[PDB]
Amino acid sequence: LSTAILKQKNRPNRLIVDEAINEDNSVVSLSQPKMDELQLFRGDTVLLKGKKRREAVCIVLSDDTCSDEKIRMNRVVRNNLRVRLGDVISIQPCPDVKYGKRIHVLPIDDTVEGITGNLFEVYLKPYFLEAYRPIRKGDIFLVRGGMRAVEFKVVETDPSPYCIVAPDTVIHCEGEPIKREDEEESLNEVGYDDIGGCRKQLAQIKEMVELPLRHPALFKEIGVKPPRGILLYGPPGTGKTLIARAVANETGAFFFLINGPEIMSKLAGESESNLRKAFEEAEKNAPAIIFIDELDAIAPKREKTHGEVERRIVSQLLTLMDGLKQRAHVIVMAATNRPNSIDPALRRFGRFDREVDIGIPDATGRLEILQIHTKNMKLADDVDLEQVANETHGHVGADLAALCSEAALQAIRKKMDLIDLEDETIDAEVMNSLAVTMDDFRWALSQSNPSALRETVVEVPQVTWEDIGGLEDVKRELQELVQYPVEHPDKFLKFGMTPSKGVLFYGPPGCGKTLLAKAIANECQANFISIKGPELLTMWFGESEANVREIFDKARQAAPCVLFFDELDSIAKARGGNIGDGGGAADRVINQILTEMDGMSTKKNVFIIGATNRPDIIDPAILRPGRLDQLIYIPLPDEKSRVAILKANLRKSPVAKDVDLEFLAKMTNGFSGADLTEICQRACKLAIRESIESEIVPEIRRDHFEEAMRFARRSVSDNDIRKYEMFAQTLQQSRGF
Amino acid sequence: LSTAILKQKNRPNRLIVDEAINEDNSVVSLSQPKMDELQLFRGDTVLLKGKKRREAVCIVLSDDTCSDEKIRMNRVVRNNLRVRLGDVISIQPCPDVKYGKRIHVLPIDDTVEGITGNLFEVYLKPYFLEAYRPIRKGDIFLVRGGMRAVEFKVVETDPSPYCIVAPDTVIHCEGEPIKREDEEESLNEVGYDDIGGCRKQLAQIKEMVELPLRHPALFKEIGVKPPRGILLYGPPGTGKTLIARAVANETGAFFFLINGPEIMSKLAGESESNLRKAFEEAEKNAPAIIFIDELDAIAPKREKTHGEVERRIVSQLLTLMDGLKQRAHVIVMAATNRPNSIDPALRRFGRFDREVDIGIPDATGRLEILQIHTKNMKLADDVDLEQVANETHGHVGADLAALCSEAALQAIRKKMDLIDLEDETIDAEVMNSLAVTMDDFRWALSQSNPSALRETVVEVPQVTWEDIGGLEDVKRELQELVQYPVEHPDKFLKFGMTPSKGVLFYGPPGCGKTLLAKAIANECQANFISIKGPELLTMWFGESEANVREIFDKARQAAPCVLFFDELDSIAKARGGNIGDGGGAADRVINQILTEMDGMSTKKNVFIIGATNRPDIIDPAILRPGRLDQLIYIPLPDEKSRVAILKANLRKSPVAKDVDLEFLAKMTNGFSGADLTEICQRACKLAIRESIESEIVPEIRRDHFEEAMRFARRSVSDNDIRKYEMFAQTLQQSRGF
Ligand SMILES: Nc1ncnc2c1ncn2[C@@H]1O[C@H](COP(=O)(O)OP(=O)(O)OP(O)(O)=S)[C@@H](O)[C@H]1O
Ligand SMILES: Nc1ncnc2c1ncn2[C@@H]1O[C@H](COP(=O)(O)OP(=O)(O)OP(O)(O)=S)[C@@H](O)[C@H]1O
Ligand SMILES: Nc1ncnc2c1ncn2[C@@H]1O[C@H](COP(=O)(O)OP(=O)(O)OP(O)(O)=S)[C@@H](O)[C@H]1O
Ligand SMILES: Nc1ncnc2c1ncn2[C@@H]1O[C@H](COP(=O)(O)OP(=O)(O)OP(O)(O)=S)[C@@H](O)[C@H]1O
Ligand SMILES: [Mg+2]
Ligand SMILES: [Mg+2]
């Protein structure tokens, strides 16, 4: 529903074109039935719209040879104009055009490379028939009679509308030929097709940029106003500049790029004039887009600033931006990488009220980035872009660009022996043999290049319910207070409660308190944030009180979200617990968590799950009825529960049928899940030890498990079982005394 | 009494006009009896006063057709001039007017759109009779003979008083027609009708602005002086700029707007001249109002300032403002969002002595804001603005503006399939089908848009006495020391005491110590401030000693107020209690609270209520006779008291008559109110679990309660009951040893 605009379906008229047996690759595709709805008369040309204001004209009504009701595929229409299939193309007439009078010929590498002669009748006579060069400023045509070597372009634009070359004219031989850099630079512009892994973010940009300007009367009738402030923020390298460069070409509005350091490097008083002129320009025309790059580099905080000239820029910006009215139709956009170093006065009502966050993509996001980035390189058949995306975790779109370059350099390293450093030019018989293989990427994933920045990742865990053995009742209970209050909200206002948000896990260590938290988030298809114990202690190093609030602020925006706190024992261990040094374990970070938890609304979908293994040093203040009410105890697995753990831990291992899984169930009594995992990890090393010494077979036998039982140590003493059971029944009574 | 001016009643002469059956909608309303009190002779026009210096003239003495003693409702008087009914309109004669001589015709979209011809006798002949265009600069009339399409306005103003067009003149055809932006911009000005949820605040502004200037002789006879400094402060987004923009149009005095960043962005020495000229202008005329926006952005603290030019502005302002005398009649107004970042020298006697605080509105306040904001949008019949106001808690007038825009965007999202992005213009047969439905707001209340700033809210709690079960004596006792010393102050000076302010609650947890504090505040119709335990610990992060004093300062101004401290155990838990690490639990925040409490006057209405559940680690210093004297102990509910708790917790649930409420009273012995609430919350989930699985009935049966008794755990041990009773009798003896 939210992304229904981007969908392109529900049209039986159109279909996918298969491979045809026709060899007619020198004619356009024209069909008769489509000719009955247009009102085109017997004119000269047909006007159509493509993309990026780039079209192409050819001979009309000349095919009548190929199949019908099918667009003929050509080897020249796949590079320009059209790039794919599934785009709606509309045509409209445009009379009162102005024909051209005099257009000269400007060659590049066709006349100077060969023979010049008269440049009129040398090779143009066999083409000047039935068409007086129907050319246009922005079209690249093709004509030759020799060795297939010709490339002609035009740069002079005398008329504003479309023009047609008239016969009986002269040739202006006093012009400068165009070089290669100019045509190459304005041919490889980026667009919406070069952005991968970001679909929801780009949907919101269109609804605020390509709708108020194109259809200004839509919002006037309703009575609402479009936003005039859009702010982009995220980690450095996500691709913020790509969005700015892509929205500047797909839209037919004026774009004015504003640099951050360029304004900051001007003289005294010169910086203030360029800002005024930028807006005085944009207010002249109705369609205008203003983009500012690195806003924080030009308008920092006014309290940590020692220079008056630096504050003058902030004052000038605050003066110029709030002076905009409705009829100006000016949209101001900005992008930065430090949302916290901003000045508070900018992100207020009227200046920057709408914000777009660019998060770190998951494997699906980076797969598309790799596919679109490696579209022109020569790849082999053993490559696999899906496998690479699984091993990369902290890689943003900037890292994938360098990874491919490193892989290409490693691939071409091995061809060092037949070329030389002092050699003049490389021979062409080895130029075509370079191809990136699978082993190239494996070496690139083991150096300092993958060493990048990695932060708190908000995504959906891949842990399923099949990886957890036993605990039938816990899984049922977890689904009755997370899945129900989200999928069917109508079941709660009828009886008249509010759902209870908050569950605390307690029990002996090594029972699987993290897999339960991940599986419930995976089942409901919600976000998951994992904050560990020591991370909160080390985060607070320079006494900053703004490093925990934005965690809740980020979790609130990504609704539904599951906020989980892991290893809650280390925090209580900082002071000691109930008595500690003499006070309590209610330290600086406990109060912030309690205050942020108490302020959450009852209509939100942010669910909080707690887990700990020290039910004797917990803070009584957190057990209040309204922060963490639910108490779930996970006991040690019994004989029946341990059957599934071994089968779940051996899914990817070729276990032989002779191994009796039920025999090891009764052998182990005081062993938890971690002990069984250790037993599996130890017993399967014997097969590797034997297989590596046999080389001077690849399957785990029965004798491998019998050897590890004499070395399997117990991790849970008999005294701890007697102590956990006491707190398993009387835990809510700890408050007060 | 305080708001008696705003009341409009006590007048039997006027009444409400109902619907009439007359179809005469082309004539003015004139009545005979009202013609006997005025002294208007047989002149030409009648002068009357409306609002915003905008009037309207028409044909006088021509109706004599409609009913009598009733103002006829018209379809053209509801847009301009008059907007409602109940305003006193007075008339006065004004002789010695100057008639006009030459007024040309300036069309907008009536002459250029069609046929021009001579522009004199084309369509104006059938109107030039019995009236020589009685027009005025500020009136919009209506005349047509075609398709009802005409809009004529005038911009040239040669005479100062009212003028009448004289016959036998010429037409000045050398003028520039007026565009659409100019007429639209000065038509939608904001006023007092666009401010909702603020009635008491606007009452004080009038008594200081629209009274000393209009009636300067009132204060001279008494011998007092009107204030010359008004400061506005509050959270960002409350609508401070609206008040400034509204008071500038409803008053007939000169207004000069002063920006904050615009002055700060000037050159060296240029900023000081604009400030001098602003006052040198205002001193010329008697009625003058000076408003400064964002005072803190121009005059910060002089100790945290590194620039000399920035301090020069503060020195210049301090020099210019105190130089004003009585006869200048100049009122200086300012508005800021950070009252603490101010310079101390400005908020003194003579510069800024009077301050207006704009608090966060309650549900009633935001309902009016929503009603006035959604006055032009197309709403459906299933909408309900009252329900939306209940779910929004931390929403200021700025947030409601964006909420409606988001709802409108969501409503128009679903119409994506019949319009296209590349389409030229939208057809008119779907332009009228857009309407906001109920489901639009539900989606808007679940995204990042409602995520706004929320602070300490001062309002009246909605908790009544019917939601509390038992405790007959506690409710009676609470009414004898809060309700009595406020409603009937005369009962205390006769016998000769001072009332005792301060009550401390102590007892086992989960008995309802917060509902008692809220109900007494609700009954007496007073404010309520809830400050929790951890909030005081986390507030003090950067060692600021000005974060607790303004809490008492704010509570003092909103008299009567009830200041309540919740969870007073965590503060004592910071050090340990009586012994702790070796010292005491009298930490940094205890002394501030004690010092602020000792300094309160005995004539104030600020009542302080304390509540805790740790009567063994309390500070003996706080039990002094004069801070917290009253000691109230809340015991566990008995069999009789628990009868009402279940009935109070099941008011919104359809409980069947077969469920015996008296059967569960004797079954529970050591269960407090929280345990019963948990039992209710657990037993009613079984009905939902059954109703969700039956779909592959909506009423709680008897078997749902019998299942939860086997899982109901006790939260109060037998040892804690024996310990609370000891302190319930000997608590005041803890002081000294
Ligand atoms: N989604 C993407 N698809 C393909 N290439 C991408 C993508 N995102 C980033 N890149 C590439 O990575 C580069 C990173 O540049 P940007 O992230 O745009 O720089 P930035 O956002 O301004 O942040 P800086 O430069 O580190 S301060 C881009 O220029 C592209 O070459
Ligand atoms: N039922 C189970 N089936 C398979 N593996 C399990 C099961 N329960 C636990 N494990 C594994 O045992 C290990 C326990 O890791 P954790 O989740 O960290 O344990 P924990 O309960 O969170 O307590 P700690 O303090 O972290 S050891 C992981 O490797 C799990 O994959
Ligand atoms: N009572 C109200 N009724 C209707 N609309 C309101 C009301 N209060 C605020 N608004 C709207 O919300 C906007 C908020 O602007 P203001 O609060 O006036 O800005 P400000 O008070 O100067 O504080 P800033 O701009 O955040 S520093 C107004 O411009 C209105 O559009
Ligand atoms: N007499 C009662 N009738 C109905 N509900 C009650 C009654 N007494 C308490 N409750 C409920 O029980 C819960 C107790 O919450 P609190 O007011 O926080 O308890 P408290 O006495 O303040 O002590 P703590 O430390 O906060 S648990 C709330 O959900 C109340 O609505
Ligand atoms: Mg773990
Ligand atoms: Mg309470």
Residue numbers in the entry:
A (entry chain A), B (entry chain B): 12 to 707, 728 to 768
Q: What do the authors report?
A:
Critical functions for p97 include the translocation and restructuring of proteins from large cellular structures such as organelle membranes and extraction of ubiquitinated client proteins to facilitate their degradation through the ubiquitin-proteasome system. Here, we present cryo-EM structural analyses of four disease mutants p97R155H, p97R191Q, p97A232E, p97D592N, as well as p97E470D, implicated in resistance to the drug CB-5083, a potent p97 inhibitor.
Despite varying degrees of differences in the ADP-bound state as compared with p97WT, all three mutants display essentially similar structures when the D1 and D2 domains are bound to ATPγS and in the state corresponding to conformation III of p97WT. This is not surprising since R155, R191, and A232 are all exposed to solvent in conformation III, i.e., no longer interacting at the N-D1 interface; therefore the mutations at these sites are not expected to affect the quaternary conformation significantly.
